[PDB]
C-alpha cells in the first residue's frame, strides 16, 4: 500500500500438532539484475575429454526461488524430533509469500560506487504453475534457502539446457527457446507483496525406519520347512534331496527377493587400503544416452553402500555433501575430511551390497560327461517379487524432484532420494524490471544501456507435513540420533568465532526399527 509500511511480518517457526506438523521458515535474499536484462545463448563443446559435457541452452535475467532442500524448513532439533519418533512423513501443502521488496540503484563515479534506493522501480514475480518451462529445481543445484535463518543469500540465476546436436555445442531444429516474459507476472513496487498457495499431490510416506529382520531369514528358526531341496546325485546319475531345516537360512525356499543391483566399485575410507594414484573416471559406472557416455551418480536405488562396520563405500552409489558451502567454479581437490559421506547401511538388510556381485546362476547344461557350472552376475535389474528400500533423505538432502514427461515411468523414486512428483512445487521466477539509463536519441534498435540496480527482500515458505505415528512393540530401546560428542571444542550446527554456520555431519532419518 505504501513505501513506508512493511509488506509482511517475519515468520519462522515449527508447530507440532498431533499427526501433522507445519514448518514456517523465512529468510532474506538478494537479486542481482543478471545479464543486464538480456538473454544469452550459452553452449559448451566437450570438456575434460567428454562430449557428455556438451550442451546448448540459454541464460535468463530471471532468478528463481529454490527451497527443495530439507534443511531449509527444519531446524536441527526439529529434524531430530521427527527422525527419532516417526515412521514416515510426506508434505501435504505449501504456501509461499514474498514481501518487503526493496530495490536499490548503484552508481559509481571515479570508483566511488554508492548504493542509494529508487522507490519507483519494480520487480517481477510469477509462478509457472503449468510446468511449461524447463524444471531446473529438481536436480540438486546450489542456491536454496540457507539452513540458518539469519544468513542472507543470493538468488540463483535461471538458465536451462536444451538438446545439443551430436554432442557438439550446436543446436538442433527440435531445440526450443523459452521466453520468460511471455508468462504474465505480477509487478511489485516496494509497498506490494506476493502470496503463493499450493497443494501437494498424494505420495507414499517416505519410510523412515530400518528393518529389524533380514529379508532372507524371515522364517522362524524353530521350524523346518515342508519343502525339500535338491542336494546331490548318487553315483549313477540319480537325484537326491534333503529337507530344508530349522535355522538354516541359506537353503530355504524364499518368497521375496532383494532390490535391483548394478556393481559400482567399493573404496575404503579412514584406515582404508585403496590403490594409489588412481584416475577415477575411466572406471566409473555409466549409461550411454544419445551416443555419449554419461556418469550416473546415486546409481538408481535398490542398492546400498557400506555394511556398517567396514569403511568401504560405494562412492559411485552414495550421497556426498561438502561440510561447508564453498564457491562457484571451484576445482579444488577435497580429501575425505571435508566431506559428509553417507551410509545406506540401515537399509542394508532389504537392499543389496553395491560392491559385491549380485549373485550367481547356472551357465551350462549338465550331462553324464559334463558337470554343472555357475556364473556370477554384476547387474540384476527388476523382477516380480522384488522388494527394496529407496535411499534415505537427509537434513541436507533435497525434498522432491519432478517426473520427466514421457509415456511411462517405472515406479519412480528420485535416485537422489525424496518425493517423485508428477506435478511439483512450481518454478518461482523473479526478475528486476529494467530501468533505461539516459536515452536522448530514438533508435529502432533496442535500448542497450541501463541503470544498474539490484533488489533485496524477504521471503517465507510455509509447509505442512503429515506423519506416520510411530507404533512398535519392540521391547528394548531403539537407537536414536543423539548429539553425542566427546571432548567438543565447538557446538555442532552453530555459528563459530568467525560467525559462519558449522555443520559437522549428515543426518539420515532411519533410526526407528520395524520388523518386516
Q: How distant, in Å, are the alpha carbons of 164, 190, 419 from that of 20?
A: 45, 35, 17
Binding mask 183-202 for a copy of itself (x = CB under 8 A): xxxxxxxxxx----------
Q: Which of residues 24-43 bind a copy of itself (CB under 8 A)?
A: 24, 26, 28, 30, 32, 35, 37-42
Q: Which of residues 385-424 bind a copy of itself (CB under 8 A)?
A: 385-390, 401-416, 420
Q: Contact with a copy of itself (CB under 8 A): which of 129, 149, 197, 199?
A: 149
* # of chain residues touching Na ion (CB under 5 A): 2
Does residue 367 touch a copy of itself according to CB under 8 A?
yes
User: What is the C-alpha to C-alpha distance for residues 333 and 347, in angstroms, rounded to an integer?
Assistant: 30
Q: Which of residues 327-366 bind a copy of itself (CB under 8 A)?
A: 327-336, 339, 346, 348-350, 352-353, 355-366
- Rg over alpha carbons for the chain, rounded to the nearest Å, is 28
Does residue 504 touch a copy of itself according to CB under 8 A?
no
User: What is the C-alpha to C-alpha distance for residues 32 and 143, in angstroms, rounded to an integer?
Assistant: 13
Quick one: CA torsion of 402, 404, 407, 412, rounded to 10 degrees?
A: -60
Judge contact between 509 and 82, C-beta under 8 A.
yes
Does residue 248 touch a copy of itself according to CB under 8 A?
yes
Q: Which of 496, 499, 495, 513 is nearest to 76 (CA)?
A: 495
* Minimum separation from the CB atom of position 508 to a copy of itself (A): 12
Nearer Cβ to Na ion (239/332): 332
User: What is the C-alpha to C-alpha distance for residues 389 and 352, in angstroms, rounded to an integer?
Assistant: 10
Of the listed pieces 202-210, 244-252, 330-338, 370-378, which binds Na ion according to CB under 5 A? 330-338
The partner in contact with residue 152, picked from Na ion, a copy of itself, none with C-beta cut-offs of 5 to 8 angstroms by kind, is: a copy of itself
Q: Contact with Na ion (CB under 5 A): which of 20, 423, 502, 505?
A: 423
Beta strands in 4-122 (DSSP E): 13-17, 20-31, 40-44, 55-64, 86-107, 114-116
Q: Which of residues 48-67 bind a copy of itself (CB under 8 A)?
A: 48, 50, 52-55, 57-59, 61, 63
Q: Which residues contact 196 (CB under 8 A, 6 or more apart)?
A: 95, 96, 97, 98, 127, 426, 428
Nearer Cβ to a copy of itself (94/316): 316
Does residue 264 touch a copy of itself according to CB under 8 A?
yes
* Minimum separation from the CB atom of position 332 to Na ion (A): 5
Does residue 95 touch Na ion according to CB under 5 A?
no
Q: Which of 175, 139, 135 is nearest to 158 (CA)?
A: 135
Does residue 428 touch a copy of itself according to CB under 8 A?
no
Does residue 92 touch Na ion according to CB under 5 A?
no
* Minimum separation from the CB atom of position 357 to a copy of itself (A): 6
Nearer Cβ to a copy of itself (197/254): 254
Quick one: CA torsion of 136, 141, 146, 147, rounded to 10 degrees?
A: 110
Q: Contact with a copy of itself (CB under 8 A): which of 260, 425, 426, 506?
A: 260
Q: Contact with a copy of itself (CB under 8 A): which of 155, 399, 428, 430?
A: 155
SS3 276: coil
Nearer Cβ to Na ion (203/218): 203
Residue with cell 563443446: 45
Per DSSP, the residues of 409-462 read --S---TTSSEEESS-S-EEEEEEPP-B----S--SSPP--B--EEEEEEEEEE
Nearer Cβ to Na ion (38/176): 38
The partner in contact with residue 423, picked from a copy of itself, Na ion, none with C-beta cut-offs of 5 to 8 angstroms by kind, is: Na ion
Amino acid at each position: 500500500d505504501g513505501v513506508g509500511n512493511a509488506s509482511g511480518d517475519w515468520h519462522c517457526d515449527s508447530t507440532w500438532m498431533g499427526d501433522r506438523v507445519v514448518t514456517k521458515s523465512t529468510r532474506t535474499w538478494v537479486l542481482p539484475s543478471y545479464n543486464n536484462h538480456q538473454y544469452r545463448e550459452i553452449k559448451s563443446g566437450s570438456v575434460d575429454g567428454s562430449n557428455a559435457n556438451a550442451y546448448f541452452g540459454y541464460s535468463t535475467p530471471w532468478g528463481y526461488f529454490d527451497f527443495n532442500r530439507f534443511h531449509s524448513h527444519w531446524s536441527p532439533r526439529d529434524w531430530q524430533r521427527l527422525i527419532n519418533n516417526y515412521w514416515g512423513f510426506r508434505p501435504r501443502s505449501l504456501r509461499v509469500k514474498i514481501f518487503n521488496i526493496q530495490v536499490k540503484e548503484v552508481t559509481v563515479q571515479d570508483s566511488t560506487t554508492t548504493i542509494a534506493n529508487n522507490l519507483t522501480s519494480t520487480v517481477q514475480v510469477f509462478t509457472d504453475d503449468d510446468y511449461q518451462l524447463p524444471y531446473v529445481v529438481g536436480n540438486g543445484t546450489e542456491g536454496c534457502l540457507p539452513a540458518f535463518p539469519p544468513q542472507v543469500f543470493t538468488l540463483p540465476q535461471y538458465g536451462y539446457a536444451t538438446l545439443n546436436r551430436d554432442n557438439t555445442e550446436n543446436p538442433t531444429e527440435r531445440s526450443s527457446f523459452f521466453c520468460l516474459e511471455y508468462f504474465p507476472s505480477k509487478m511489485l513496487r516496494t509497498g506490494n507483496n506476493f502470496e503463493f498457495t499450493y497443494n501437494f499431490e498424494e505420495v507414499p510416506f517416505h519410510s523412515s525406519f530400518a528393518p529389524s529382520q533380514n529379508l532372507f531369514k524371515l522364517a522362524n528358526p524353530l521350524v523346518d520347512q515342508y519343502l525339500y531341496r535338491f542336494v546331490s546325485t548318487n553315483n549313477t546319475g540319480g537325484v537326491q534331496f534333503n529337507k530344508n531345516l530349522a535355522g538354516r537360512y541359506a537353503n530355504t525356499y524364499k518368497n521375496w527377493f532383494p532390490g535391483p543391483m548394478g556393481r559400482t566399485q567399493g573404496w575404503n575410507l579412514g584406515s582404508g587400503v585403496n590403490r594409489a594414484s588412481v584416475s577415477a573416471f575411466a572406471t566409473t559406472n555409466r549409461m550411454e544416452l544419445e551416443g555419449a557416455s554419461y556418469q550416473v551418480p546415486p546409481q538408481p536405488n535398490g542398492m546400498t553402500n557400506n555394511l556398517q562396520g567396514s569403511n568401504t563405500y560405494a562412492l559411485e552409489n552414495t550421497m556426498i555433501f561438502n561440510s561447508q558451502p564453498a564457491n562457484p567454479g571451484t576445482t579444488a581437490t577435497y580429501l575425505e575430511g571435508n566431506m559428509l559421506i553417507t551410509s545406506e547401511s540401515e537399509t542394508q538388510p532389504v537392499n543389496r551390497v553395491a560392491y559385491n556381485v549380485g549373485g550367481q546362476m547356472a551357465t551350462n547344461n549338465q550331462s553324464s560327461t559334463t558337470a554343472p557350472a555357475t556364473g556370477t552376475y554384476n547387474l540384476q535389474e527388476i523382477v516380480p517379487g522384488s522388494v527394496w528400500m529407496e535411499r534415505d533423505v537427509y537434513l541436507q538432502g533435497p525434498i522432491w524432484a519432478k517426473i520427466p514427461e514421457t509415456g511411462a515411468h517405472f515406479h519412480p523414486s528420485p535416485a537422489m532420494g525424496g518425493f517423485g512428483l508428477k506435478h511439483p512445487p512450481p518454478m518461482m521466477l523473479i526478475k528486476n524490471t529494467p530501468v533505461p539509463g539516459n536515452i536522448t536519441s530514438f533508435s529502432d534498435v533496442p535500448v542497450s544501456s541501463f541503470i544498474t540496480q539490484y533488489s533485496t527482500g524477504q521471503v517465507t515458505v510455509e509447509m505442512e507435513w503429515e506423519l506416520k505415528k510411530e507404533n512398535s512393540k519392540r521391547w528394548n530401546p531403539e537407537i536414536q540420533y543423539t548429539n553425542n560428542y566427546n571432548d567438543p571444542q565447538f557446538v555442532d550446527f552453530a555459528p563459530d568465532s568467525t560467525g559462519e554456520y558449522r555443520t559437522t555431519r549428515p543426518i539420515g532419518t532411519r533410526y526407528l526399527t520395524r520388523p518386516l
